């Protein structure tokens, strides 16, 4: 059973993502600690110390970026695991679908269907010859061109 272990380790993935997130937020705490030192060094009349304070700040920013990249990598591998759980479930459902198709095709197959094909074709063929012959012989009895000509004449006096 892969389902519970996938969930089991997903419970640890963001378990460590929260460790990473706290690691991050500590860095912005230190960045806020040092930004006001940059501010004060800017105001105290000599500006060239603020460059070294900025050296500190950009190092902290790089640390933040690296930690965020690590968290993103963790998220990506987690999503891959979830995707593959979905894929395995799809494969199992497809296997069951193949099984039910086997069960249904266990009933009828081509040869009985072909027997029905030819029996229906022959029966309808004889049927059509009987019906057409009957219609022709009943119409071999009374007029066609005349007996149609007054037909619309009968309709004309109705409307």
């Amino acid at each position: 059973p892969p389902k519970e272990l996938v969930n089991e380790w997903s419970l640890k993935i963001r378990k460590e993502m929260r460790v990473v997130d706290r690691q991050i937020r500590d860095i912005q705490r230190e960045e806020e600690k040092v930004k006001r030192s940059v501010k004060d060094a800017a105001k105290k009349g000599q500006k060239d110390v603020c460059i070294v304070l900025a050296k500190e700040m950009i190092r902290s920013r790089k640390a933040v970026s690296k930690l965020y990249a690590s968290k993103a990598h963790m998220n990506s591998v987690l999503m891959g695991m979830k995707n593959q759980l979905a894929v395995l479930r799809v494969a199992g459902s497809l296997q069951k679908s193949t099984e039910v198709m086997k069960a249904m095709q266990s009933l009828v197959k081509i040869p009985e269907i072909q027997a029905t094909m030819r029996e229906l074709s022959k029966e309808m063929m004889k049927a059509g010859i009987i019906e057409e012959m009957l219609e022709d012989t009943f119409e071999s009895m009374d007029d066609q061109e005349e007996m149609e000509e007054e037909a619309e004449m009968e309709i004309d006096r109705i409307l």
Binding site: V64, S65, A72, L85, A86, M101, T116, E123, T137
Partner: protein, 147 residues
């Protein structure tokens, strides 16, 4: 043993449950995506140049995975539609067999020759009746004179 009808009806809502899971593991990712959007929006205020690109990459990853989630969900739908039309095919087959049996046992009582005999007898009787009428009118109308 289990009847084949039970297997198909079980597979129906089994595939439905698979769609259900796919729905859920989809739904979690839009929440994750909205969290990423909120984070990238709040973080872009202070700039910091680079980490925005990592978050955008993660956003694109989430979109690519919801793509596949929707794709497998659609695949399950096609499988369900096939297994559903399968029993319609079976029903067509059995009804066709029944109508063929009925029509065969029906036209087994009347064939080509005996109806042809009946029909020739009809034509002969119609000949006799029409000859009765035509000459009956003929001799007595021609017996009439001056008109």
């Amino acid at each position: 043993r289990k009847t084949p009808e039970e297997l198909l009806r079980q597979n129906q809502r089994a595939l439905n449950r698979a769609m259900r899971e796919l729905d859920r593991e989809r739904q979690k990712l839009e929440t994750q995506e909205k969290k990423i959007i909120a984070d990238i929006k709040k973080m872009a205020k202070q700039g910091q140049m680079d980490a925005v690109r990592i978050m955008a990459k993660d956003l694109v990853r989430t979109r690519r995975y919801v793509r596949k989630f929707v794709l497998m969900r659609a695949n399950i739908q096609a499988v369900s539609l096939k297994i559903q039309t399968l029993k319609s095919n079976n029903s067509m087959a059995q009804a066709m067999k029944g109508v063929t049996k009925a029509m065969g046992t029906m036209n087994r009582q009347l064939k080509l020759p005996q109806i042809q005999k009946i029909m020739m007898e009809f034509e002969r009787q119609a000949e006799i009746m029409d000859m009765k009428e035509e000459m009956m009118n003929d001799a007595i109308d021609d017996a009439m004179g001056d008109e």
